[PDB]
């Protein structure tokens, strides 16, 4: 399976605009990820990381994005907060693994890398793995509004990038390797 292609990618999207890579019809070697020091966080939900090689799935979805370290914790089931609520949500259910690493020497810049954005205003929260990449000035009561007039605010903001690159493996013809 094309794991390195996702984890070692040179470019990641913003959280609000998270990208989904579908992994299927392949052998998933999780040993490379499992026992590596690459990740600062390796969190699985109801799934034993050590046993990932022994689990078959219809497919695996690797959701890739960059989020501030502080908000990495929001990428989990049963969470609230600006990311959990408006940018990227995980369902209240079992989940595969949320893998993340420090990218201060990759994405962060001395003046702040503001190339990455996030959502903070929306007419309701996101559904599990919903992607909202619209950009219409927020209006508190559904009315038409034009910025920078009163009550007219852009729903998106910028990240003051320390950033972490996060890849979430959501599980649904892909299995781990066999032992000879």
């Amino acid at each position, epitope marked *: 399976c094309p794991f390195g292609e996702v984890f070692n990618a040179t470019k990641f999207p913003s959280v609000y605009a998270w990208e989904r890579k579908k992994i299927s019809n392949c052998v998933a070697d999780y040993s490379v990820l499992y026992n590596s020091t690459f990740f600062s966080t390796f969190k699985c939900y109801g799934v034993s990381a050590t046993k990932l090689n022994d689990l078959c799935f219809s497919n695996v979805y690797a959701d890739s994005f960059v989020v501030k370290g502080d908000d990495v914790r929001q990428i989990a089931p049963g969470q609230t907060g600006v990311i959990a609520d408006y940018n990227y949500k995980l369902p209240d259910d079992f989940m595969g693994c949320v893998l993340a690493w420090n990218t201060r020497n990759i994405d962060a810049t001395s003046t702040g890398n503001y190339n990455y954005k996030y959502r*903070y205003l929306r007419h*309701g929260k996101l559904r599990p793995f919903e992607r909202d990449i619209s950009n219409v000035p927020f209006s508190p*009561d559904g009315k038409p509004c034009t910025p920078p007039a009163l009550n007219c605010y852009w729903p998106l903001n910028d990240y003051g990038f320390q950033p972490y690159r996060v890849v979430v493996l959501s599980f649904e013809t892909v299995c781990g390797p066999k032992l000879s």
Partner: antibody, heavy 124, light 109 residues
Framework: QAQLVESGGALVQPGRSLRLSCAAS????????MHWVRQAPATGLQWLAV????????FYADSVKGRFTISREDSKNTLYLQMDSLRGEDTAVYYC????????????????????WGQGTTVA | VLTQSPLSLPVTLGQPASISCRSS???????????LNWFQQRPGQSPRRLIY???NRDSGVPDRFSGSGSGTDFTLKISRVEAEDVGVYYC?????????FGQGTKVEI
């Protein structure tokens, strides 16, 4: 033990400006959204405006939008209301209002509690 | 818009009371909750919250206070009105911006 104390109320002639202040204590001012609400027989309790914790966004009721400005000085833990072109209809007791629960400090959640009220200052 | 009823509720000291509040629109928010709160204002003083989310008491609020309701129709219930309860009860909705209050119900002793 959040506490709000309003001051700067006065009699204002039509068309004139008045600025109210509200001293906050018992909580970290910087970590909470702040609101102004006014009371009058005409409207009962009427919400006017909110300023977010970072002082960046400001939302206003149609009844005052374009005339009132909400602002805050974090360094003094003080909330202000700038009432320009004040009208007779603006006669009311102005309350400084906030909330104790800031676990969701984002729109519109700071309107859900509004459980912290000051003494209220009369403006006419 | 929130409308309370009756506007004036004369309650013999020690007797129960009930203040209604009807909204012009369902107060259920986008997350399925209902942000309909009740406040009590003593003459000469500010409003204080007693009930939140239609029926939940705030810490420090006497057990004589409760409530119920759904959709548009909500009620503030008092098992017995005390002399200290004299004042105006308000309903407040935060579900739809801008947040609004009812006209308030005066409860007399």
């Amino acid at each position: 033990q959040a506490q709000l104390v309003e001051s700067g109320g006065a009699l204002v002639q039509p068309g004139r400006s008045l600025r109210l202040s509200c001293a906050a204590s018992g909580f970290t001012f910087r970590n909470y959204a702040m609101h102004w609400v006014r009371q009058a027989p005409a409207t009962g309790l009427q919400w006017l405006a909110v300023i977010t914790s970072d002082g960046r966004n400001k939302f206003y009721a149609d009844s005052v939008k374009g005339r009132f400005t909400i602002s805050r000085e974090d360094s003094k833990n003080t909330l202000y209301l700038q009432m320009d072109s004040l009208r007779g209809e603006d006669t009311a007791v102005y309350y400084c209002v906030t909330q104790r629960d800031n676990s969701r400090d984002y729109f519109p959640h700071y309107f859900h509690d509004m459980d912290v009220w000051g003494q209220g200052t009369t403006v006419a | 818009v929130l409308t309370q009823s009756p506007l004036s509720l004369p309650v013999t000291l020690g007797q129960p009371a009930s203040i209604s509040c009807r909204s012009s629109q369902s107060l259920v928010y986008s997350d399925g909750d209902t942000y309909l709160n009740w406040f009590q204002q003593r003459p000469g003083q500010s409003p204080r919250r007693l009930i939140y989310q239609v029926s939940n008491r705030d810490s420090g609020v006497p057990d004589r206070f409760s409530g119920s309701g759904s959709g548009t129709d909500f009620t503030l219930k008092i098992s017995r009105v005390e002399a200290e309860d004299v004042g105006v009860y308000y309903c407040m909705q935060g579900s739809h911006w801008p947040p609004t209050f009812g006209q308030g119900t005066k409860v007399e002793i």
